[PDB]
Write a protein that binds this ligand. Structure first.
Ligand SMILES: NC(=O)c1ncn([C@@H]2O[C@H](COP(=O)(O)O)[C@@H](O)[C@H]2O)c1/N=C/N[C@@H]1O[C@H](COP(=O)(O)O)[C@@H](O)[C@H]1O
Length: 229
């Protein structure tokens, strides 16, 4: 599947900061109209300040489309997860907290179930060739590999992993083969339609596409047609 994505700040569509308007819902609806089966939202406001998580906007956006939406952005507590699910999102995306407090997040897998959670890992390949997990592009490696972290969560049913390279096709070929029971999502690196063709057959289950759609390089419809071949 293709997974079209938007980043939101105070109701505004942005790309990291370029502004793309205050009307996210017509965009999402047209992404769905073209055949998308899943949408992806990052709440940058909420990531910066969990008091200001855009629950009301997200409720509206989810109600306005007919496909599952996965939503992340500084999810830190059990309460955050439950509030997003209650507002109707299909899956909550968890990056930083999943690296920081794995035993606590394993509890969340037990409470909400693996179908409701996506583990998001920022990865950079270090000089030693190791796929290191980092909590963001602005901070050093955490001293845990992709493999270690994935294997920490497998005993509680881990199913969905979102993997971004922030240091390439080879990466995804390798991790998808090693964990065939996990559905990996690629994120970043899509500059034109050929980057999508390049991911076909790697074993990646979902391709997240953000900026390229906003900049008009191709449509969701063309991306799906290339993806499905
Ligand atoms: N400041 C940020 O940019 C940021 N902060 C957190 N995230 C993501 O949110 C998720 C949860 O992170 P936490 O806040 O829980 O730590 C993770 O996936 C992070 O990568 C962030 N990601 C933002 N944009 C994403 O980066 C990729 C760019 O794609 P492109 O347009 O096609 O080129 C896509 O996945 C976009 O949705």
């Amino acid at each position: 599947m293709i997974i079209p994505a938007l980043n939101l700040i105070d109701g505004t569509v942005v790309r990291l900061q370029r502004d793309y308007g205050n009307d996210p819902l017509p965009r999402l609806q047209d992404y769905a109209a073209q055949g998308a089966g899943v949408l992806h939202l990052v709440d940058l406001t909420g990531a910066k300040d969990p008091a200001k998580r855009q629950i009301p906007l997200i409720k509206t956006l989810v109600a306005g489309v007919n496909v599952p939406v996965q939503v992340g952005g500084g999810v830190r507590t059990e309460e955050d997860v439950a509030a997003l699910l209650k507002a109707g999102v299909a899956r909550v995306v968890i990056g930083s907290t999943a690296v920081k407090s794995p035993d606590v997040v394993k509890g969340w897998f037990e409470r909400f179930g693996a179908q409701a959670l996506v583990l998001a890992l920022d990865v950079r390949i270090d000089e030693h060739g190791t796929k290191q997990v980092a909590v963001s592009g602005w901070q050093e490696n955490s001293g845990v590999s992709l493999e270690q972290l994935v294997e920490t969560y497998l005993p509680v049913g881990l199913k969905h992993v979102l993997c971004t390279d922030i240091s390439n096709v080879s990466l995804y070929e390798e991790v998808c083969a090693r964990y065939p029971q996990i559905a990996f999502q690629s994120s970043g690196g899509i500059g034109d339609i050929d980057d999508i063709a390049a991911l076909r057959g790697t074993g990646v289950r979902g391709v997240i596409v953000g900026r390229a759609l906003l900049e008009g390089k191709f449509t969701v419809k063309e991306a799906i047609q290339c993806w499905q071949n």
